[PDB]
Amino acid sequence: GPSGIVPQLQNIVSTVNLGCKLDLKTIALRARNAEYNPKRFAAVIMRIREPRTTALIFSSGKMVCTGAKSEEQSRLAARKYARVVQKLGFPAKFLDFKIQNMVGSCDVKFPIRLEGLVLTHQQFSSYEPELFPGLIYRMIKPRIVLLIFVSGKVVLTGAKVRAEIYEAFENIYPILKG
Amino acid sequence: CVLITCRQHNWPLTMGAICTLLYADLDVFSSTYMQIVKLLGLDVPSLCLAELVKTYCSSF
């Protein structure tokens, strides 16, 4: 097993389709928590304080949300945005909700020399410190990208489910243990 | 491509020395540089520490 630590989650990304078309100008007119610029962009930006999240709603009726810590909180916030649209007068409905991504991170309590890792896992490792300090690891099982630093901190992205994050975590555990 | 060529011959060359001639900027050229390398997946060494110092020190 791991050294008593399982990665935390940093962000959630999700999408939902509201089932109807919308007038963005009206929504921006009447929403206290929204920002929109019709002359350059085709979606209205809104935020809620709990769960502390943002939503991006197009005129086509699709919606993108970020800022969540967990999938349930993303779903709750998306339902909240759906209610917000409903009270604005549109026939908004909460359909086909789906999580799209989440971010995870962990630390191993000891330093890691990245040069050895790039010298041994060339097929997956990127080491260009002059461009970005962190080492980039393209992991294949699960299809996850891990970002590694000299402090022993590791960051995970690209999963559809949390089990993918933890799976990549214990997959990389023996490699970093070397 | 010229850069990775020199890297194959472990020939020391740095990032801006190329961008000097190309009207480029850090973000533009670095982001693009990553794009082709991941696209082609070709193996290429890093800048080995001692190599660059010879040409750098000799310039004084």
Add this chain to the structure above:
Amino acid sequence: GSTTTYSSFRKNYYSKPWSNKETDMFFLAISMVGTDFSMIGQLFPHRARIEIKNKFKREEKTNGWRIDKAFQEKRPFDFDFFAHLLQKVLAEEEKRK
């Protein structure tokens, strides 16, 4: 003209810091206008929209409670009165200093 030329990340250019009274106007704007960062960029011609978003990102780290408290303490909205309040309070700040 030399081969020693340095290249490093210049996208963090020196931006103008934020004033405490300017922050107070920012809060009374959340009270008064809302979170329409483009609109706030218009009420603050000296700040652009990205500055408003960065300001929100900095404030949300600790001052979410004050964000909510201002947002519930709603006030009727007037651009003209807003602009007058800004430059008058700024002039008062300079005169006190």
